[PDB]
Amino acid sequence: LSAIIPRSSWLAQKPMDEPLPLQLPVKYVVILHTATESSEKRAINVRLIRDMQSFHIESRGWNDIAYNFLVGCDGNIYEGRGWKTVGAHTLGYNRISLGISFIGCFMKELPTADALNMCRNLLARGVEDGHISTDYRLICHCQCNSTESPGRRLYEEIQTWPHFYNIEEE
Numbered sequence: 001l002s003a004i005i006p007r008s009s010w011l012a013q014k015p016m017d018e019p020l021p022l023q024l025p026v027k028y029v030v031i032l033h034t035a036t037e038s039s040e041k042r043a044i045n046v047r048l049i050r051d052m053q054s055f056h057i058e059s060r061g062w063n064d065i066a067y068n069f070l071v072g073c074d075g076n077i078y079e080g081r082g083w084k085t086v087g088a089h090t091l092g093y094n095r096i097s098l099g100i101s102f103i104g105c106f107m108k109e110l111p112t113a114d115a116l117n118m119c120r121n122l123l124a125r126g127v128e129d130g131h132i133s134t135d136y137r138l139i140c141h142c143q144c145n146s147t148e149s150p151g152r153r154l155y156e157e158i159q160t161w162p163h164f165y166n167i168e169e170e
């Protein structure tokens, strides 16, 4: 958990209104992407995250950056709203999941191996610390709402991960 880059490291602004507590442990984990450029340099990812918080607060009218966590192609996990806060990333699932978004656009390409592995470590970390249910269901954004997110190629990768839940075939 110390490997997680905190909000203060990307100069986050404090939420406009009191955030909503998320009832833990979460039953679902949604994987998304930002549909932005990707970068292997921490300085660039930090720029993207801070500009995204503004996009979400000022361009979208939301309370804070939408995701609970972000994964950069530099292999880092960045704190979004965190482990205990209801996100604004997946309509119909915000109150019962953690939203993890990969920084980039993965319609054809895949995030770096390190980014993919750190994301898996983040999931194990959450289960191990009790934030994520032991029998949690891992799902993708596109399975919940009409959207390319987290990108076709990344979606194909995720469905090969343990805990992947096929909402349609069930």
Ligand SMILES: CC(=O)N[C@H]1[C@H](O[C@H]2[C@H](O[C@H](C)C(=O)N[C@@H](C)C(=O)N[C@H](CCC(=O)N[C@@H](CCC[C@@H](N)C(=O)O)C(=O)N[C@H](C)C(=O)O)C(=O)O)[C@@H](NC(C)=O)[C@@H]3OC[C@H]2O3)O[C@H](CO)[C@@H](O)[C@@H]1O
Pocket (backbone or CB within 6 Å): 032, 033, 034, 035, 036, 052, 055, 061, 062, 063, 064, 066, 086, 087, 088, 089, 090, 091, 092, 093, 094, 095, 101, 105, 145, 146, 147, 148, 149, 151
């Ligand atoms: C390549 C691609 O992914 N394109 C998609 C495109 O991707 C967008 C892209 O979207 C990415 C994939 C993304 O992460 N989108 C999420 C945040 C999104 O828009 N999610 C909404 C739900 C948002 C949400 O939960 N909002 C809360 C906001 C609540 C406000 C306040 N209470 C707060 O807590 O902040 C809400 O309404 N919650 C209520 C109360 C509830 O859950 O009951 C959804 O499921 O479609 C945006 N990038 C960023 C960083 O925001 C950007 O703007 C357009 C494009 O680039 O989205 C459109 C749909 O809008 C899709 O059709 C496209 O296929």
